[PDB]
Design a protein around this ligand. Structure first.
Ligand SMILES: O=C(NO)c1ccc(CN(Cc2cccnc2)S(=O)(=O)c2cc(F)c(F)c(F)c2F)cc1
Ligand SMILES: [K+]
Ligand SMILES: [K+]
Ligand SMILES: [K+]
Ligand SMILES: [Zn+2]
Length: 355
Protein backbone atom coordinates (compact mmCIF):
# COMPACT_ATOMS: atom_id res chain seq x y z
CA UNK A 1 0.00 0.00 0.00
CA UNK A 2 1.81 3.08 -1.34
CA UNK A 3 1.44 6.78 -0.47
CA UNK A 4 2.41 9.24 -3.19
CA UNK A 5 4.03 12.63 -2.62
CA UNK A 6 4.46 15.41 -5.17
CA UNK A 7 6.78 18.39 -4.59
CA UNK A 8 8.69 20.54 -7.08
CA UNK A 9 10.88 23.42 -5.98
CA UNK A 10 10.05 25.28 -9.20
CA UNK A 11 6.77 26.25 -7.55
CA UNK A 12 8.90 28.47 -5.28
CA UNK A 13 9.54 30.82 -8.23
CA UNK A 14 6.14 32.54 -7.85
CA UNK A 15 6.88 35.53 -5.65
CA UNK A 16 5.90 39.06 -4.67
CA UNK A 17 8.32 41.44 -6.42
CA UNK A 18 7.87 44.24 -3.90
CA UNK A 19 7.31 42.48 -0.56
CA UNK A 20 9.62 39.56 0.27
CA UNK A 21 7.69 39.14 3.54
CA UNK A 22 4.26 38.60 1.99
CA UNK A 23 2.76 35.63 3.90
CA UNK A 24 2.19 33.47 0.76
CA UNK A 25 5.92 32.66 0.84
CA UNK A 26 7.94 30.47 -1.52
CA UNK A 27 9.30 28.69 1.56
CA UNK A 28 5.81 27.49 2.53
CA UNK A 29 6.32 24.40 0.38
CA UNK A 30 10.05 23.95 1.02
CA UNK A 31 9.41 24.08 4.78
CA UNK A 32 6.70 21.42 4.61
CA UNK A 33 9.01 19.30 2.45
CA UNK A 34 11.87 19.77 4.92
CA UNK A 35 9.72 18.60 7.84
CA UNK A 36 8.83 15.43 5.90
CA UNK A 37 12.59 14.80 5.53
CA UNK A 38 13.23 15.47 9.23
CA UNK A 39 10.50 13.06 10.33
CA UNK A 40 11.74 10.51 7.75
CA UNK A 41 8.33 10.44 6.05
CA UNK A 42 9.70 11.35 2.61
CA UNK A 43 11.51 8.05 2.04
CA UNK A 44 8.30 6.22 2.99
CA UNK A 45 6.46 7.83 0.03
CA UNK A 46 6.68 7.22 -3.70
CA UNK A 47 7.57 10.47 -5.46
CA UNK A 48 5.00 11.48 -8.11
CA UNK A 49 6.47 13.88 -10.71
CA UNK A 50 5.14 17.36 -11.25
CA UNK A 51 3.99 18.43 -14.71
CA UNK A 52 2.33 21.38 -16.40
CA UNK A 53 -1.43 21.40 -16.75
CA UNK A 54 -2.45 21.96 -20.36
CA UNK A 55 -4.67 24.82 -21.49
CA UNK A 56 -7.29 22.23 -22.46
CA UNK A 57 -7.18 20.93 -18.88
CA UNK A 58 -7.51 24.46 -17.48
CA UNK A 59 -10.61 24.86 -19.68
CA UNK A 60 -12.33 22.12 -17.67
CA UNK A 61 -13.12 24.86 -15.12
CA UNK A 62 -11.91 28.23 -16.49
CA UNK A 63 -12.86 30.52 -19.36
CA UNK A 64 -10.51 31.06 -22.27
CA UNK A 65 -10.30 34.77 -21.39
CA UNK A 66 -9.13 34.03 -17.84
CA UNK A 67 -6.57 31.50 -19.11
CA UNK A 68 -5.37 33.96 -21.74
CA UNK A 69 -4.86 36.84 -19.28
CA UNK A 70 -2.92 34.85 -16.68
CA UNK A 71 -0.87 33.31 -19.50
CA UNK A 72 0.05 36.78 -20.79
CA UNK A 73 1.42 37.79 -17.38
CA UNK A 74 4.47 35.60 -18.04
CA UNK A 75 5.68 38.26 -20.51
CA UNK A 76 4.59 41.41 -18.63
CA UNK A 77 6.83 44.23 -17.45
CA UNK A 78 6.79 44.93 -13.67
CA UNK A 79 4.44 47.92 -13.99
CA UNK A 80 1.93 45.72 -15.84
CA UNK A 81 2.25 42.86 -13.34
CA UNK A 82 1.40 45.33 -10.58
CA UNK A 83 -1.55 46.76 -12.48
CA UNK A 84 -2.91 43.31 -13.40
CA UNK A 85 -2.51 42.05 -9.83
CA UNK A 86 -4.41 45.09 -8.53
CA UNK A 87 -7.38 44.18 -10.77
CA UNK A 88 -8.04 41.15 -8.53
CA UNK A 89 -8.97 40.69 -4.89
CA UNK A 90 -5.71 39.92 -3.02
CA UNK A 91 -3.38 38.83 -5.84
CA UNK A 92 0.32 39.42 -6.51
CA UNK A 93 1.95 38.29 -9.77
CA UNK A 94 5.48 37.68 -11.05
CA UNK A 95 6.60 36.43 -14.46
CA UNK A 96 6.79 32.88 -13.03
CA UNK A 97 3.27 32.82 -11.55
CA UNK A 98 1.52 31.25 -14.55
CA UNK A 99 4.09 28.45 -14.72
CA UNK A 100 3.77 27.72 -10.99
CA UNK A 101 -0.03 27.64 -11.20
CA UNK A 102 0.24 25.18 -14.11
CA UNK A 103 2.67 23.05 -12.09
CA UNK A 104 0.42 23.02 -9.01
CA UNK A 105 -2.54 21.76 -11.05
CA UNK A 106 -0.54 19.27 -13.13
CA UNK A 107 1.02 17.88 -9.95
CA UNK A 108 -2.45 17.15 -8.62
CA UNK A 109 -3.61 15.64 -11.92
CA UNK A 110 -0.66 13.21 -11.83
CA UNK A 111 -1.49 12.36 -8.19
CA UNK A 112 -5.18 11.73 -8.92
CA UNK A 113 -4.18 9.57 -11.91
CA UNK A 114 -1.80 7.55 -9.72
CA UNK A 115 -4.65 6.95 -7.27
CA UNK A 116 -7.28 6.13 -9.88
CA UNK A 117 -5.00 3.68 -11.73
CA UNK A 118 -4.20 1.86 -8.48
CA UNK A 119 -0.51 2.83 -8.55
CA UNK A 120 -0.83 4.43 -5.09
CA UNK A 121 -3.52 4.17 -2.44
CA UNK A 122 -3.41 7.86 -1.50
CA UNK A 123 -1.22 10.92 -1.94
CA UNK A 124 -0.14 14.33 -0.70
CA UNK A 125 0.53 17.38 -2.90
CA UNK A 126 2.86 20.10 -1.54
CA UNK A 127 1.95 22.79 -4.05
CA UNK A 128 1.60 26.56 -4.42
CA UNK A 129 0.06 28.98 -5.33
CA UNK A 130 -3.24 27.80 -3.80
CA UNK A 131 -6.47 27.34 -5.72
CA UNK A 132 -9.81 27.26 -3.95
CA UNK A 133 -10.61 30.99 -4.27
CA UNK A 134 -10.04 30.92 -8.05
CA UNK A 135 -13.23 31.26 -10.10
CA UNK A 136 -14.14 30.28 -13.66
CA UNK A 137 -13.39 33.83 -14.85
CA UNK A 138 -11.03 35.36 -12.31
CA UNK A 139 -8.14 35.02 -9.88
CA UNK A 140 -8.72 35.73 -6.20
CA UNK A 141 -7.06 35.45 -2.80
CA UNK A 142 -3.58 34.23 -3.84
CA UNK A 143 -5.22 31.71 -6.25
CA UNK A 144 -4.96 31.74 -10.06
CA UNK A 145 -6.54 28.43 -11.12
CA UNK A 146 -8.73 26.17 -8.98
CA UNK A 147 -6.43 23.20 -8.54
CA UNK A 148 -8.87 21.07 -6.52
CA UNK A 149 -11.81 21.75 -8.86
CA UNK A 150 -9.63 21.08 -11.90
CA UNK A 151 -8.40 17.85 -10.33
CA UNK A 152 -11.98 16.67 -9.79
CA UNK A 153 -12.82 17.33 -13.45
CA UNK A 154 -9.55 15.75 -14.57
CA UNK A 155 -10.45 12.66 -12.51
CA UNK A 156 -13.82 12.42 -14.27
CA UNK A 157 -12.11 12.90 -17.64
CA UNK A 158 -9.96 9.77 -17.16
CA UNK A 159 -12.66 7.61 -15.56
CA UNK A 160 -16.31 8.40 -16.22
CA UNK A 161 -17.92 11.80 -16.45
CA UNK A 162 -20.16 11.13 -13.41
CA UNK A 163 -17.42 9.83 -11.07
CA UNK A 164 -18.44 10.83 -7.54
CA UNK A 165 -15.79 13.18 -6.11
CA UNK A 166 -15.95 14.56 -2.58
CA UNK A 167 -14.00 17.77 -1.89
CA UNK A 168 -13.47 18.41 1.82
CA UNK A 169 -12.17 21.97 2.28
CA UNK A 170 -10.74 22.47 5.78
CA UNK A 171 -8.84 25.65 4.91
CA UNK A 172 -10.01 28.31 7.37
CA UNK A 173 -11.49 30.33 4.49
CA UNK A 174 -14.50 29.43 2.38
CA UNK A 175 -13.55 28.06 -1.02
CA UNK A 176 -15.80 30.42 -2.99
CA UNK A 177 -14.40 29.31 -6.34
CA UNK A 178 -14.90 25.63 -5.61
CA UNK A 179 -18.46 26.14 -4.39
CA UNK A 180 -19.39 28.18 -7.48
CA UNK A 181 -17.74 25.82 -9.98
CA UNK A 182 -19.76 22.85 -8.66
CA UNK A 183 -22.86 24.59 -7.27
CA UNK A 184 -25.13 23.11 -9.98
CA UNK A 185 -23.44 19.70 -9.89
CA UNK A 186 -24.41 16.49 -8.08
CA UNK A 187 -21.27 14.60 -9.14
CA UNK A 188 -18.93 16.69 -6.96
CA UNK A 189 -19.92 17.01 -3.30
CA UNK A 190 -18.38 20.16 -1.79
CA UNK A 191 -18.06 20.32 2.02
CA UNK A 192 -16.38 23.37 3.53
CA UNK A 193 -15.61 24.24 7.15
CA UNK A 194 -14.65 27.87 7.56
CA UNK A 195 -14.49 30.88 9.79
CA UNK A 196 -17.47 33.00 8.74
CA UNK A 197 -18.31 35.61 11.43
CA UNK A 198 -21.69 36.38 9.82
CA UNK A 199 -20.06 37.15 6.49
CA UNK A 200 -17.38 39.47 7.87
CA UNK A 201 -14.38 37.11 7.54
CA UNK A 202 -12.54 36.86 4.22
CA UNK A 203 -13.72 36.30 1.49
CA UNK A 204 -16.55 38.41 2.96
CA UNK A 205 -19.51 36.83 1.14
CA UNK A 206 -22.73 35.39 2.49
CA UNK A 207 -22.30 32.68 -0.19
CA UNK A 208 -20.45 30.87 2.61
CA UNK A 209 -23.42 30.53 4.98
CA UNK A 210 -25.06 27.20 5.85
CA UNK A 211 -28.20 27.92 3.83
CA UNK A 212 -26.39 27.73 0.47
CA UNK A 213 -27.10 24.06 -0.29
CA UNK A 214 -26.58 24.00 -4.07
CA UNK A 215 -28.60 24.73 -7.20
CA UNK A 216 -30.53 22.74 -9.80
CA UNK A 217 -29.46 19.11 -9.87
CA UNK A 218 -26.80 20.08 -7.28
CA UNK A 219 -29.30 20.86 -4.52
CA UNK A 220 -27.98 19.22 -1.36
CA UNK A 221 -24.46 18.75 -2.77
CA UNK A 222 -22.97 21.92 -1.24
CA UNK A 223 -22.40 21.80 2.53
CA UNK A 224 -21.14 24.97 4.25
CA UNK A 225 -20.16 24.64 7.92
CA UNK A 226 -19.64 28.26 9.05
CA UNK A 227 -18.06 29.15 12.40
CA UNK A 228 -19.10 32.24 14.36
CA UNK A 229 -17.93 33.78 17.62
CA UNK A 230 -15.26 31.35 18.74
CA UNK A 231 -11.59 30.35 18.50
CA UNK A 232 -12.41 26.94 17.13
CA UNK A 233 -10.08 23.97 17.48
CA UNK A 234 -9.94 20.19 17.68
CA UNK A 235 -13.19 19.57 19.63
CA UNK A 236 -15.19 21.69 17.20
CA UNK A 237 -13.73 20.14 14.06
CA UNK A 238 -14.19 16.63 15.49
CA UNK A 239 -17.82 17.43 16.34
CA UNK A 240 -18.46 18.73 12.80
CA UNK A 241 -16.91 15.58 11.33
CA UNK A 242 -18.96 13.29 13.58
CA UNK A 243 -22.34 14.99 13.05
CA UNK A 244 -22.07 16.24 9.44
CA UNK A 245 -18.97 15.55 7.36
CA UNK A 246 -18.75 11.79 7.79
CA UNK A 247 -22.47 10.83 7.71
CA UNK A 248 -22.95 12.93 4.57
CA UNK A 249 -19.77 11.60 2.94
CA UNK A 250 -20.69 7.98 3.66
CA UNK A 251 -24.15 8.47 2.16
CA UNK A 252 -22.64 10.16 -0.90
CA UNK A 253 -20.25 7.17 -1.27
CA UNK A 254 -17.45 9.01 -3.12
CA UNK A 255 -15.13 7.26 -5.54
CA UNK A 256 -12.36 9.80 -4.81
CA UNK A 257 -11.73 12.25 -1.96
CA UNK A 258 -9.80 15.47 -2.50
CA UNK A 259 -8.88 17.54 0.54
CA UNK A 260 -8.49 21.29 0.04
CA UNK A 261 -6.01 21.18 2.86
CA UNK A 262 -5.25 24.68 3.95
CA UNK A 263 -3.54 24.84 7.32
CA UNK A 264 -4.54 28.37 8.28
CA UNK A 265 -6.95 27.10 10.93
CA UNK A 266 -3.89 25.83 12.80
CA UNK A 267 -2.71 27.11 16.15
CA UNK A 268 -0.23 29.92 15.46
CA UNK A 269 -1.53 31.08 12.06
CA UNK A 270 -1.23 34.89 11.64
CA UNK A 271 -4.59 35.18 9.78
CA UNK A 272 -6.99 32.41 10.78
CA UNK A 273 -7.18 33.00 14.53
CA UNK A 274 -8.07 29.33 15.25
CA UNK A 275 -6.27 26.56 17.13
CA UNK A 276 -6.55 23.21 15.35
CA UNK A 277 -3.52 21.13 16.34
CA UNK A 278 -1.35 18.80 14.23
CA UNK A 279 -2.99 15.92 16.12
CA UNK A 280 -6.37 17.34 15.15
CA UNK A 281 -5.46 17.39 11.45
CA UNK A 282 -4.19 13.81 11.80
CA UNK A 283 -7.57 12.65 13.11
CA UNK A 284 -9.43 14.45 10.31
CA UNK A 285 -7.21 12.70 7.76
CA UNK A 286 -7.68 9.33 9.45
CA UNK A 287 -11.47 9.68 9.29
CA UNK A 288 -11.44 10.61 5.60
CA UNK A 289 -9.31 7.52 4.86
CA UNK A 290 -12.40 5.40 5.64
CA UNK A 291 -14.10 6.72 2.45
CA UNK A 292 -13.68 5.82 -1.23
CA UNK A 293 -11.66 2.67 -0.41
CA UNK A 294 -8.96 4.97 0.99
CA UNK A 295 -8.58 7.01 -2.23
CA UNK A 296 -7.60 10.38 -0.69
CA UNK A 297 -5.54 13.21 -2.22
CA UNK A 298 -4.46 15.96 0.21
CA UNK A 299 -3.85 19.26 -1.64
CA UNK A 300 -2.09 22.16 0.09
CA UNK A 301 -4.10 25.37 0.02
CA UNK A 302 -3.44 28.14 2.56
CA UNK A 303 -1.63 28.26 5.89
CA UNK A 304 0.98 30.87 6.79
CA UNK A 305 2.75 29.93 10.03
CA UNK A 306 5.67 28.00 8.50
CA UNK A 307 6.17 25.83 11.59
CA UNK A 308 2.46 25.14 12.06
CA UNK A 309 1.84 24.12 8.45
CA UNK A 310 4.98 21.95 8.36
CA UNK A 311 3.98 20.02 11.47
CA UNK A 312 0.32 19.88 10.45
CA UNK A 313 0.73 18.58 6.90
CA UNK A 314 3.45 16.11 7.96
CA UNK A 315 1.02 14.59 10.47
CA UNK A 316 -1.54 14.14 7.67
CA UNK A 317 1.03 12.23 5.59
CA UNK A 318 1.85 10.06 8.62
CA UNK A 319 -1.84 9.07 8.71
CA UNK A 320 -1.94 8.36 4.96
CA UNK A 321 1.05 6.07 5.49
CA UNK A 322 -0.91 4.00 8.03
CA UNK A 323 0.54 5.31 11.31
CA UNK A 324 -1.63 5.14 14.41
CA UNK A 325 -3.58 8.32 15.26
CA UNK A 326 -2.06 10.40 18.07
CA UNK A 327 -3.84 11.20 21.32
CA UNK A 328 -6.24 14.14 21.45
CA UNK A 329 -6.92 16.42 24.41
CA UNK A 330 -11.07 20.98 26.87
CA UNK A 331 -14.84 21.23 26.38
CA UNK A 332 -16.72 21.84 23.15
CA UNK A 333 -17.69 25.45 22.46
CA UNK A 334 -21.44 25.99 22.43
CA UNK A 335 -21.26 28.37 19.46
CA UNK A 336 -19.93 25.43 17.45
CA UNK A 337 -22.99 23.39 18.47
CA UNK A 338 -25.18 26.23 17.18
CA UNK A 339 -23.42 26.12 13.80
CA UNK A 340 -23.59 22.32 13.55
CA UNK A 341 -27.32 22.38 14.34
CA UNK A 342 -27.90 25.03 11.66
CA UNK A 343 -26.28 22.80 9.01
CA UNK A 344 -28.26 19.77 10.22
CA UNK A 345 -31.53 21.63 9.71
CA UNK A 346 -30.41 22.81 6.25
CA UNK A 347 -29.26 19.40 5.03
CA UNK A 348 -31.39 16.76 6.80
CA UNK A 349 -33.97 17.22 3.98
CA UNK A 350 -31.35 15.93 1.50
CA UNK A 351 -29.35 13.41 3.58
CA UNK A 352 -31.25 10.67 5.42
CA UNK A 353 -28.18 9.93 7.57
CA UNK A 354 -28.84 13.23 9.37
CA UNK A 355 -32.46 12.45 10.33
O1 LIG B 1 -5.69 32.01 0.57
C1 LIG B 1 -5.82 32.58 1.67
N1 LIG B 1 -5.52 32.02 2.86
O2 LIG B 1 -5.05 30.93 2.85
C2 LIG B 1 -5.96 33.99 1.81
C3 LIG B 1 -6.53 34.65 0.83
C4 LIG B 1 -6.52 35.97 0.89
C5 LIG B 1 -5.85 36.63 1.88
C6 LIG B 1 -5.87 38.14 1.84
N2 LIG B 1 -5.99 38.70 3.11
C7 LIG B 1 -7.29 38.92 3.62
C8 LIG B 1 -7.61 38.17 4.91
C9 LIG B 1 -7.69 38.89 6.06
C10 LIG B 1 -7.97 38.26 7.21
C11 LIG B 1 -8.14 36.91 7.17
N3 LIG B 1 -8.05 36.25 6.08
C12 LIG B 1 -7.79 36.80 5.00
S1 LIG B 1 -4.74 39.68 3.64
O3 LIG B 1 -3.57 39.24 3.38
O4 LIG B 1 -4.90 39.74 4.89
C13 LIG B 1 -5.03 41.30 2.96
C14 LIG B 1 -5.57 42.27 3.74
C15 LIG B 1 -5.78 43.52 3.22
F1 LIG B 1 -6.28 44.51 3.97
C16 LIG B 1 -5.49 43.72 1.92
F2 LIG B 1 -5.68 44.91 1.43
C17 LIG B 1 -4.96 42.73 1.09
F3 LIG B 1 -4.64 42.97 -0.18
C18 LIG B 1 -4.75 41.51 1.63
F4 LIG B 1 -4.22 40.55 0.94
C19 LIG B 1 -5.25 35.94 2.88
C20 LIG B 1 -5.25 34.61 2.85
K1 LIG C 1 -12.81 25.81 3.97
K1 LIG D 1 -23.01 30.97 -4.55
K1 LIG E 1 -21.80 20.50 -5.66
ZN1 LIG F 1 -7.13 30.09 3.62
Amino acid sequence: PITGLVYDQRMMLHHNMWDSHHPELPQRISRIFSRHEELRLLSRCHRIPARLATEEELALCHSSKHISIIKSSEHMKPRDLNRLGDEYNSIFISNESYTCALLAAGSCFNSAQAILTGQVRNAVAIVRPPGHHAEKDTACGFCFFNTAALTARYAQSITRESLRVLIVDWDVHHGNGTQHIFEEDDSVLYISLHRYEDGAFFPNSEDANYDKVGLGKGRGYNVNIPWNGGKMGDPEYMAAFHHLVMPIAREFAPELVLVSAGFDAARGDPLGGFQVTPEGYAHLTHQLMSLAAGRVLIILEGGYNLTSISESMSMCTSMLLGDSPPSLDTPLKTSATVSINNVLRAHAPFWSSLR
